[PDB]
Amino acid sequence: QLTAAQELMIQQLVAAQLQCNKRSFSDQPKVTPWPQSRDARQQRFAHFTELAIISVQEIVDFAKQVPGFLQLGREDQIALLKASTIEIMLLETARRYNHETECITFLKDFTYSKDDFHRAGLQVEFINPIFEFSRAMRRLGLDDAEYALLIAINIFSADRPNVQEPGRVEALQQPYVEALLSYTRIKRPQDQLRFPRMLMKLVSLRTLSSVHSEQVFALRLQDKKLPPLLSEIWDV
Ligand SMILES: CC(C)N1[C@@H](O)C(NCCCCc2cccc(S(N)(=O)=O)n2)=C(c2ccccc2)S1(=O)=O
């Protein structure tokens, strides 16, 4: 059984995620509209980069609500968020993938297909893994609690670059891993391999993070510049 502390924490991560989602779709009409070459492709790219900026702000606001994140130094708080942002973005992207339409819905009604992603200015080398991962995630069928716990485990990764106190980070990850392991045993007691399969997704997210780095490097060669916010997180 889950302890009262485990239950309240799980519910709090779920509540923190619903709140980020609610205040984001509320602040949706303040995004460059989605519209033939030149100017329209520039506008399409500006639209797509603005959605990423909203997600970075959302992730930062969620992290602050994650118990234990405020125990870390400002230094390590940045180091963890810097590396986790895209991995969290991809997890959330997989969560808004529709099997019937083969489309990802950002915010409230912004719906995108594989073609729409290529129109925004992304490589097939990066689009295919997104949808490949989105379909792979659909097969697990994670609830709001399992998604929230996975993000918390992803945030508190001690092996991230520039982490001054990895011991502190590893100690903070432990209660979340314990919570997900307990939740899994309660939810589906028949499927013992549900928990390792969720952790195998963290393995996949690291490869996807490298693919995303290759996508950013490709944009520099394509003379497409990133906004000041996204440049701070995703550049050499
Ligand atoms: C050109 C570079 C800088 N890129 C982009 O401009 C971008 N824009 C879309 C941002 C997704 C916003 C998003 C994610 C997840 C959840 C919610 S939300 N607001 O609906 O909760 N929004 C990327 C992206 C695409 C798919 C998955 C992850 C990243 S990119 O890094 O290739």
Numbering used by the authors: 219 to 253, 259 to 459
From the paper:
These compounds have a central cyclic sulfone amide scaffold with lipophilic substituents on both sides identical to AZ876, except for the tert-butyl substituent replaced by a propyl group in AZ1–3 and AZ6. The third substituent from the core is a larger elongated amine linker that is different in AZ1–6. Analysis of crystal structures of LXRβ LBD in complex with WAY-254011, AZ3, AZ6, and AZ8, as well as of previously published crystal structures of LXRβ31,40,55 reveals that GW3965 and BMS-852927 are the only compounds not forming a direct hydrogen bond with LXRβ His435 and therefore they do not stabilize the His435–Trp457 activation switch crucial for the agonistic conformation of H12.
The liver X receptors (LXRs) alpha (LXRα, NR1H3) and beta (LXRβ, NR1H2) are members of the nuclear hormone receptor (NHR) superfamily of transcription factors that function as heterodimers with the retinoid X receptor (RXR) and activate or repress gene expression in response to binding of cholesterol derivatives or synthetic ligands. Transcriptional responses of LXRs are known to directly result from ligand-induced conformational changes in the receptor: similarly to other NHRs, in the absence of ligands or in the presence of antagonists, LXRs form complexes with corepressors, while binding of agonist ligands forces the C-terminal helix H12 of the receptor to fold into the active state that creates an activation function-2 (AF-2) coactivator-binding surface. Reaching isoform selectivity by rational structure-based drug design has proven to be difficult since the ligand-binding pockets (LBPs) of LXRα and LXRβ are virtually identical. Since the adverse lipogenic effects are considered to be largely driven by LXRα23,28, drug discovery efforts have focused on developing LXRβ-selective compounds.
